[PDB]
């Protein structure tokens, strides 16, 4: 005679913390920005950004994958 | 005689915390921005941005996946 | 006669912590920025950024993978 | 002339979470209880209890008081 | 002329968490209890209990008092 | 002229966490108990308990007080 007791217990935790988290009393200060542009000639496509402060979180990465598998073969 | 007691317990926890979280006292300062553009010539497509402050939390990455698979067999 | 008891207990705590976490009392200061441009001549595709301060957290790296596999057999 | 703008904002949050809350997986097991009493004598008040399991969650204490006083005086 | 602006803002928490909260996978196991009582004599008040498991979460504390006062006097 | 601005901001977080919080895998065991009371004799008040396991979480003390007081005066 045979018994199989198959009782995996999984309490595991898979946590991603990403970006600007738990930060306190930040005062990021952009200075003055002055742009003079005169008589400039562009023969082709232009991409431009101007500004005193960029404050940015970009988070492509959080990305948890859990793969879990439980085979029991009695043949 | 045969007994199989297939009783996994899953209490596991997959969690993603992405971007800006729990940030307690921020005062981002946009500076003054001045742009003077004169007699500029563009032959082709222009893309532009102007501003004192950008305050951006872009998150492509929340990203959780969980694959789980139970497979008893008795043949 | 045969008994198999298969009681794995998983309490694992796979954690990622990326970017600006738990920072206190920053005052990042951008200086004044002055750009003079006159009579420039661009023959091909242009990309430009001007600004006093960049305060950026870019995080592609959260990235948790857990692969877990149980495989009992009785042939 | 005199102007008084008395506009206090209350958004504050008193809260009590007393007792047995959010407890996920529990299986309290009472055991076998056997009592044999013979030839006993009790000349005064008896109070008694017998049982395998008590799961009591008595909460006398969880109350709030939130006294608030406002007074504007112009004598 | 006189201006008084009186705009206190309260967003504060006053939280009590008391007793038995957020617990996981508990299995308290009372054992066998056997009582033999023979020929016992009690001349005064008896208060008695028998049992394998007391899973009791008594909370007679955990209350809150918030007292708040706002006096503006213009005498 | 006289201008008084009175803007106290409260973001505070008075918090109590008392008793058995966030425990993850307890299996408290009670042993077998066997009591052989024979021929005993009690002339005065008896208070008694028998049992394998107490899992008691008494919280008589976890309370909060926040006392808060604003006074503005113009004599």
Curated annotation (Swiss-Prot), chains A, B, C, D, E, F:
Changing residue 48 to L: In fatal respiratory hypoventilation; unusual apparent autosomal recessive inheritance; reduced binding to microtubules as well as increased fibrillization and aggregation. The gene is MAPT. Tau/MAP repeats lie at residues 2-32, 33-64. Phosphorylation at serine and threonine residues in S-P or T-P motifs by proline-directed protein kinases (PDPK1, CDK1, CDK5, GSK3, MAPK) (only 2-3 sites per protein in interphase, seven-fold increase in mitosis, and in the form associated with paired helical filaments (PHF-tau)), and at serine residues in K-X-G-S motifs by MAP/microtubule affinity-regulating kinase (MARK1, MARK2, MARK3 or MARK4), causing detachment from microtubules, and their disassembly. Phosphorylation decreases with age. Polyubiquitinated. Requires functional TRAF6 and may provoke SQSTM1-dependent degradation by the proteasome. PHF-tau can be modified by three different forms of polyubiquitination. 'Lys-48'-linked polyubiquitination is the major form, 'Lys-6'-linked and 'Lys-11'-linked polyubiquitination also occur. The modification N6,N6-dimethyllysine is found at residue 7. The tau/MAP repeat binds to tubulin. Type I isoforms contain 3 repeats while type II isoforms contain 4 repeats. This is Microtubule-associated protein tau. The modification Phosphoserine is found at residues 1, 20, 48, 52. The record marks 7, 13, 17, 27, 36, 39, 66, 71 as: Not glycated.
């Amino acid at each position: 005679s045979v018994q199989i007791v198959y009782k995996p217990v999984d309490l595991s935790k898979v946590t991603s913390k990403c970006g600007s988290l738990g930060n306190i009393h930040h005062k990021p200060g952009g200075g003055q920005v002055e742009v003079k542009s005169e008589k400039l000639d562009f023969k082709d496509r232009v991409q431009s950004k101007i500004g005193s402060l960029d404050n940015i979180t970009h988070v492509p990465g959080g990305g948890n994958k859990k793969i879990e598998t439980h085979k029991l073969t009695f043949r």
